[PDB]
A paper describes a structure:
APP and its paralogues APP-like protein 1 ([name]) and APP-like protein 2 (APLP2) contain the highly conserved heparan sulfate (HS) binding domain E2, which effects various (patho)physiological functions. The ectodomains of all APP-family proteins share the N-terminal E1 domain and the central E2 domain. Comparable to the E2 structures of other APP-family proteins, a coiled-coil-like fold is formed by helix αB (Gly302–Gln338) and the first half of helix αC (Lys344–Arg379). The C-terminal parts of helices αC (Val380–Leu399), αD (Ala406–Val437), αE (Pro439–Asp468) and αF (Pro471–Gly491) constitute a four-helix bundle.
We identified a new orthorhombic crystal form of the E2 domain of [name]. The respective structure was built and refined to 2.6 Å resolution. Indeed, the N-terminal helix αA was not observed in the new crystal form (although it was present in the protein construct used), suggesting that it is rather flexible and becomes sufficiently stabilized only by certain intermolecular interactions. The apo structure of [name] E2 revealed an unfolded and hence flexible N-terminal helix αA. The folding of helix αA is shown to be independent of the other structural parts of [name] E2. A similar arrangement has been described for [name] E2 in previous studies and was functionally connected to heparin binding. Despite the similar overall topologies of these dimeric [name] E2 assemblies, the Cα r.m.s.d. value of approximately 1.5 Å (for helices αB7–αF) is rather large between the crystal structure described here and that solved previously. Beyond the differently structured N-terminal segments (N-terminal residues Asp292–Ile304), a high overall similarity of the heparin-bound and unbound [name] E2 structures was observed.
Numbering used by the authors:
A (entry chain B): 305 to 492
B (entry chain A): 302 to 489
Write the structure that this text describes.
Amino acid sequence: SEHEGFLRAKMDLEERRMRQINEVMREWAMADNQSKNLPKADRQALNEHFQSILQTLEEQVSGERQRLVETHATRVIALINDQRRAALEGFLAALQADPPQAERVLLALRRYLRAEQKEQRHTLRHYQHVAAVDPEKAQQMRFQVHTHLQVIEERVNQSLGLLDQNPHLAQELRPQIQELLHSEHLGP
Amino acid sequence: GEISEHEGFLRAKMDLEERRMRQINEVMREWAMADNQSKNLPKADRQALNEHFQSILQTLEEQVSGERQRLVETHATRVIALINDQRRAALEGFLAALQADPPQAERVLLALRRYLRAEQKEQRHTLRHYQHVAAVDPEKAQQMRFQVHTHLQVIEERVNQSLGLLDQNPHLAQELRPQIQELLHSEH
């Protein structure tokens, strides 16, 4: 599970780094106790030695976290994309069967819409997370999120357009689909 | 309660996320729905329509971050106070066991164990907070760097002073010295 591995990956890093930080803080404390009677100019330079070590360490933690986050986001989006495409191909296949079967078509469409529901939720959840901790960044992606939602809606519309090519089948399934579109917030 | 504080903070964050998401979801929906309606409209009307929704979202994003910041700062303040109280409660118990007539070795050890545990927790939280700020905001971490160092030294002193209160009773200190070192080894 991508969620499992990512969670414990952040955990291992939090643990590794908390030890390293403690060890540096430890060594910093020792050097102060050792140089407690040194002149002020001597003591300034010593602190600056350990501040320098911690800045590098802070930067490494920061870059480490950015990489962990971006890799995870890339994979989640990759999985969502693949679920959608796989579901589209399956749906297309149910449509193209001889003859088309309402059950198979319905189940296949159900998978496709569910993949798009997932894509919508993720798009909105992430936008909402960014707004919570970075309003300036949220303002910047605001229109791209909006655009993303339009792309999804247009996918759902185009898929419903394919089912409509078989008018009887579209009629036979319509009530169940309207129920599905309301529940997943995907229709028009 | 420490655990209650944790769980209550998660339900408080979760509930804020849900409420806000629903709000955002509706506005984004309305924003997508408004676009289909406005495709025929003049460019001035089209842009005004977008500016309407982007405006509503801007205040939302600001509210969201405002809520998140307030919630986080409150939780931070409480956790700190909780740790201070736990330390002070443990210190009193430790002194009570030492100042009792006469001291009982097993009680002094338990009281001590509770105090070091409190300081372990204090130290641990001090470190964790610092690390988290480093991962998300290197500039703030550089700022708080010296204070964390100072804080850890203060904790190091307290552990020594308490160990020094025990050593003031030489037989007691000898009776417990093998057990005391085990405690210190596992923690600090």
